[PDB]
Structures are given as structure tokens and as C-alpha cells.
Amino acid sequence: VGFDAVTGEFTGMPEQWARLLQTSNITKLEQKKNPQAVLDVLKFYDSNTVKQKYLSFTPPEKKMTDEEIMEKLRTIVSIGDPKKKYTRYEKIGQGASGTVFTATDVALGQEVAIKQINLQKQPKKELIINEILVMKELKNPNIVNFLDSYLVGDELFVVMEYLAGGSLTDVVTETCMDEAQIAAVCRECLQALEFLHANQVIHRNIKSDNVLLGMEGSVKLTDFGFCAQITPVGTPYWMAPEVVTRKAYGPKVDIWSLGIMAIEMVEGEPPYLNENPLRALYLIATNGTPELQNPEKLSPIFRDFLNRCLEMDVEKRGSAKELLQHPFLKLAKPLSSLTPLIMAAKEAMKS
Amino acid sequence: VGFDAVTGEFTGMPEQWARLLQTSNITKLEQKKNPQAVLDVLKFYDSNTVKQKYLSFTPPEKKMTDEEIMEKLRTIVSIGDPKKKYTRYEKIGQGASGTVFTATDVALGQEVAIKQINLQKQPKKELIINEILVMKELKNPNIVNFLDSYLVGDELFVVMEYLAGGSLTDVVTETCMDEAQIAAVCRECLQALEFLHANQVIHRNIKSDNVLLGMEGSVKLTDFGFCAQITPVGTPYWMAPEVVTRKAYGPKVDIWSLGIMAIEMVEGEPPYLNENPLRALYLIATNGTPELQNPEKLSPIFRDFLNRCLEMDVEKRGSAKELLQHPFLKLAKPLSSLTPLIMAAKEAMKS
């Protein structure tokens, strides 16, 4: 509850938070200069709910029987064998979100992601089916869209779009993107965010891992809902200061995350790489922006874009509609300019 | 068209029927004494359509989209894995009626038959689904009833009741049924036929192969519709003279077939066993009843029942409601009396 400034002791802290603080590698001086922030990040880290989101309501606003399931599945389920329509199956994930596969549609030659939900075992069947119903009308080229679904016993196969160019992470870790490429990627991600925000969705997880690239440079976001959670513990480097403050927050957390990602595209790794997670949260809460590797190397107009994304004041932080008009995006190359970086990244994996 | 009595030549016969008649092993004298019958059986044998029946209209009277299929399947499909709910799968048939399996329900311990229909490849999807919808309300203990269905991709699994005692054929070929056992089986088959007839269904295939026995002597018919076609070319020994005449026919063909089956239960084999099929049809058309092995061995009251089933006049042939009241059925033993015959038959198969 309270803090004594000269001793440096918090008064009346819960069992867990006293325990966490000792492991935090936050200094007594740091506790002194920002006592409120420390309590905020201790509370945040203690919460640690997986906090799964589901899109709801197909129209503009956005204990179950076999017959009610078959009612809901009327407009989503195709009569087809997913073992004949798709090949090159590879398992890429398993957990509470279903098992997940990549595969290739035999007829079109296009890669897809297939999520497999056990309707009998899975809790909140109604939410998942409701999300698919949303996803059928919630269509945009910069997201992974719902393609198809199949009922295989008690197992619902949800097929989403996918791309064969890898993640943006692979490109930034293995190559050096110039600013005109970074502008191109930022523009595509802002187009996606503008669409998501227009439809009352906050993504919440904008990071290069959730940015999927096609071979000709097409860009799509993933991990915004349940169904699009098709990519597979540590520091949440991408989170805005309001979130880790445990304040109420809005769509401009995605803008913060986009700024963090633009820094990742320059430095070739995420920030806070070797930090204690609690210290990292503390640093996000007090400092916001992690200090740059070598900031003279960037152009002023990119530094401007980075500032407008990484403003700590939510009112001063830019909207997606606003940043779409920012001069940095005018430096943007054709998306095909990414093709050599993607191929280089693919042949550099060597694993 | 015509016949010249002294030469013994039919005039103006089609290509096929002149061809068939030479292979028929019907005599010139036999052609003479019954010229009309010969033409009737030649026409009948030339027709040879598989002539699949489907029950239609669930209420008292009795180019398709994925969404229309999922509409129709609303009340029939369970959300479950048929590979986990049933074990001891054995494939017992394949063809135009789907692939067919026996299996055992894990939870209940009861044997079932599972028919597997490819919805994408199968013609007349609507008829099959309509039949299942009938089968859900068309319930009787002396038929195999619809239990459950599952959608597995484009494959619809239809689960029907089954029994582990084998067919009536196995019991008659390997054991000697006394008349009180035969009365018991006839009563059960007439109870089934009375129900089928009451619901405007003619079975059309009453033979011991389609009579399924349980271990404690329970009796059920199969092969009346599409779904109940769960048992797997030669002589149609069981057919009434009206059918092979190619006249119009009614439900009392099932009564003829029941009489033929009661003879099979005595002689231990079907009639016409080594005949030419065309001669067999000729003999059914002219003589009706095949001549008995040793008729003094049967009781007069059984011979009476056999006469009322195997009357060639449809008006004199008995109805199922009528034969249920016939004195022969009063000789009927408890169905458990079949249990030793079934076990004997099962251990006699040795294959």
C-alpha cells in the first residue's frame, strides 16, 4: 500500500509481491524514483492469465446439443475430405487453441493453415463457432482469412490462409532491411490495423512473429482472434506502457507494438533480450522506449515515425488512419523488393 | 409374340430372348404346355435391374449444396468420433450401397453395423438422408433400427443395430430345427412384416440370409431399405410367382418368401440349388411350390401354414395379420430355445 522513502521499504505488500520484487532485479533507487510503477508491474506479472480473445457478432456490431452445433455449422462446413484436398501436412503447434498444421491445397497449389478443434473436449464451443461466423464476413487482404471448414467426427477443421515466405522475424534476423522496405511493411501492417480497429478488434500481439510474408512480398497479420491464432514464457517486449501499468487501454496499443516492431526491423532482434522479465516490465513502465543501438544511422523521418508510434501519451500516440498519411510511408518500395530478403532468409535457416 | 403349337417355335422373339431361351434348359414340351410363362420369365431375366429401394416421407405417409446437406443432417448427426466409440471393426461388404462394417459399441458392449456413404461421390444423396429421417421414426424390435450417425469429412457413417448370433442360414445349414423353433422364428418374422406392411414398405427379400439372430434368440430382419441393407449372381428362389411373371404385385410377396424360408428351415438348403436360373424361374412361374424332400415328416398343421403362405392365388395367400393368428404359431417355443442351435452353428463354421 505505502512506501517509506528513506528506508526504501514498501508497507503491507502481499506475500506474492514481496516475493516477486526480490527476484525482480529492480534497484532500491529505482523503487524510490518510481514506487507506483513497481507496484503496477508486480501486479501485472502476478496476474498472468492466458486471456484468450474471441471475435463475437457477425452483423455490424462486433450445455450445447449436437443439433445446436449442427445448426451453427450450417453455413460453415463443407462436405469434403481434408486428407484429399490438402497435402504436405506438417504439425506446427498443439495446445489449448487446438492442434495446428500447415498444408498445401492440391488444386490451387497455395499453402494454408489448418486448425483442428475437438468439439467434444473444447470449452466454449459457441464462441469458436461464433468467431468463424464473424471471420466469414470479416475479410481483408492484410489478415489471414477464413477459407473453409470440415467436420471430421467430433473434430472441426478450420482452414485459414497462409504464406510460404516465412515470418518477418526470419527476414530481420537474417538480413538487413533498408528503410524503404520497412516503410512498405509498416504500411501493410497499418492497413491491417486500420481494418481491425474499424471492426472493433484490438490485435494485442503485433510482433514480427505474427507477421507472415509471401514469396512475392504480400504481407498478412495473424494471432488477432481464435481462428487466426495459427503461429506458435518470457518478456512481453511489444506491450505498451498502459497495458503493463494495468490501466484501461484502447487500440493504440497496436501502434506502440508496431513501433517496437519497426525497431526490431532495424536492430535485428527484439528489445529486452537478456533482461529479467520483471525489470523489462519496469523499464517499459518508466522509460517506455528502450534506448537505441546506434540512432544516428536512421533517417530523421523514420525517427519521427518511431516517435509518433512510441509516444507514451495515448492522445499524442498516432492512430492507424493518421500514420497511414505519415511521410515515412512515402519512402516505401514495391513489395517484391522483399523477395530477395525472403529467399535469403529461407536458405539461411539451415536447420 | 406368337407360338406355333406343333413345331414348338415362338414367332418374332427379340434377339436376346431367342438367345436366352436356348441356354434356359426349358424343354420344347414345357414351352408347349406353358408358352406365356416362358415369355414372362425370359422378359424378367432380361430386365435384371439392381432396382434399389429407398424409404421416403418421415410423417405418416411413407445439384445439392453443402448447406442443404448440413440442413438435412441437423437432426441425424452426432458430434463424436466413430473410431473411439466402436471397436472390433470388421469389413463385411463393399459396393454401390456404401462400404459396410460390423463393430462393437465400447460403452454398451453391443454389436452394431456401420454403413459408410461417400456424400460427394454417392448419387441420390437426398434419398439416403430422407431414408435415415424415416428410420428415426420407423422403429420396431424385429427390424434393425437406426442408432446413430457421424459426419467424417465427406463420409457419412450410419450406425444400425446388429446381433452376434449369426444369420438364420447358419442355423438351418448346421442344425436341425424342430417345428416349435420354426414357429417361433415365423412369428417374429410375421411381426416384422406386419409392421413393415402397416408402414407401406414391402421388404422384397425375405430369406434366411436377411434374418439376423441374437445369442438369446432375438430375431431381426435386414435388407428392407437402403440403411438396413447391411448383409452381403444366381437363382432368386424366394420370389413369388407374380414377380417373375412380371405382373403387378403387393405385400403378400413377403408371405410367399416367408413360406419358402420355412421350407429352407426344414430342408437345410434353399430350393433350386443346382438348377439353371432360367429353368428355376420357369418352375416358379408354372409350379410355384418346389416339390418337398420328404413331406410326411412334417405335421399337418405346419403343412397347412406352408399352404397358406405358398398359395399361388394372391387373394387366397395369407396376410401377415392373418398368419399371426394361425394355429401353427401356437406350437412356438421360447426364443431362448434357439441359443444351443446358434452356439452349435457358430462352433460348426470352422473357417
Side-chain angles (χ1 to χ4, degrees), chain A residues 65-67 69-71 73-75 77-82 84 118-121 150-155, chain B residues 65-67 69-71 73-75 77-82 84 118-121 150-155:
Chain A
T65 65
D66 290 356
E67 191 272 335
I69 293 162
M70 288 285 306
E71 266 267 12
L73 297 176
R74 176 175 59 247
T75 69
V77 168
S78 292
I79 307 304
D81 186 9
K84 288 178 180 193
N118 197 302
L119 268 16
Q120 188 173 303
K121 294 179 184 170
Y150 306 93
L151 214 224
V152 185
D154 56 0
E155 214 81 21
Chain B
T65 65
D66 290 356
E67 191 272 335
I69 293 162
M70 288 285 306
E71 266 267 12
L73 297 176
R74 176 175 59 247
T75 69
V77 168
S78 292
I79 307 304
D81 186 9
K84 288 178 180 193
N118 197 302
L119 268 16
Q120 188 173 303
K121 294 179 184 170
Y150 306 93
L151 214 224
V152 185
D154 56 0
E155 214 81 21

Side-chain angles (χ1 to χ4, degrees), chain B residues 153-225:
Chain B
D154 56 0
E155 214 81 21
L156 180 74
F157 284 48
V158 181
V159 183
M160 303 298 286
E161 284 173 334
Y162 203 82
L163 297 167
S167 66
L168 180 64
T169 305
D170 301 331
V171 160
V172 306
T173 54
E174 293 302 335
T175 79
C176 183
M177 289 176 72
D178 58 67
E179 278 183 16
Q181 291 167 331
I182 298 177
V185 168
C186 285
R187 187 231 298 121
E188 294 299 302
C189 300
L190 284 162
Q191 288 172 0
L193 286 178
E194 191 231 75
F195 172 86
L196 287 178
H197 294 166
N199 285 281
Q200 298 314 124
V201 177
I202 307 174
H203 190 288
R204 295 177 183 76
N205 292 291
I206 298 292
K207 45 185 167 176
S208 59
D209 291 350
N210 299 341
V211 179
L212 185 64
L213 270 53
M215 291 298 315
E216 308 212 72
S218 174
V219 170
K220 289 176 180 283
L221 270 53
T222 64
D223 298 8
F224 41 103

Side-chain angles (χ1 to χ4, degrees), chain A residues 19 24 53 58 103 107 129 145 163 185 189 192 215 226 232 234 262 327 351:
Chain A
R19 204 178 193 228
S24 73
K53 270 62 192 72
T58 92
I129 303 158
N145 296 286
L163 297 167
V185 168
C189 300
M215 291 298 315
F226 177 88
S351 299

Side-chain angles (χ1 to χ4, degrees), chain B residues 315-335:
Chain B
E315 292 289 316
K316 302 183 179 182
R317 182 152 63 238
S319 100
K321 289 157 293 171
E322 289 172 355
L323 290 168
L324 281 172
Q325 313 303 326
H326 187 287
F328 173 62
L329 304 191
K330 311 190 85 165
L331 264 40
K333 265 174 177 180
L335 289 168

Side-chain angles (χ1 to χ4, degrees), chain B residues 90-159:
Chain B
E90 176 166 17
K91 191 167 169 181
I92 67 168
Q94 175 182 342
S97 304
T99 296
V100 182
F101 293 87
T102 55
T104 301
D105 179 301
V106 177
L108 301 182
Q110 187 62 39
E111 198 165 317
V112 299
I114 301 184
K115 179 182 280 258
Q116 179 197 304
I117 302 102
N118 197 302
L119 268 16
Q120 188 173 303
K121 294 179 184 170
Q122 190 80 26
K124 304 153 291 168
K125 307 170 187 77
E126 195 179 358
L127 291 185
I128 293 168
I129 303 158
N130 283 342
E131 177 159 317
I132 301 164
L133 289 163
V134 168
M135 290 292 208
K136 272 174 62 67
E137 287 134 41
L138 195 67
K139 297 278 185 165
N140 177 270
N142 292 114
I143 63 174
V144 296
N145 296 286
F146 173 84
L147 288 177
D148 249 300
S149 185
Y150 306 93
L151 214 224
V152 185
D154 56 0
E155 214 81 21
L156 180 74
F157 284 48
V158 181
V159 183

Side-chain angles (χ1 to χ4, degrees), chain B residues 19 22 27 43 54 56 78 102 154 166 213 215 234 237 331:
Chain B
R19 204 178 193 228
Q22 287 181 257
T27 316
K43 180 170 181 69
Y54 299 84
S56 213
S78 292
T102 55
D154 56 0
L213 270 53
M215 291 298 315
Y237 54 86
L331 264 40

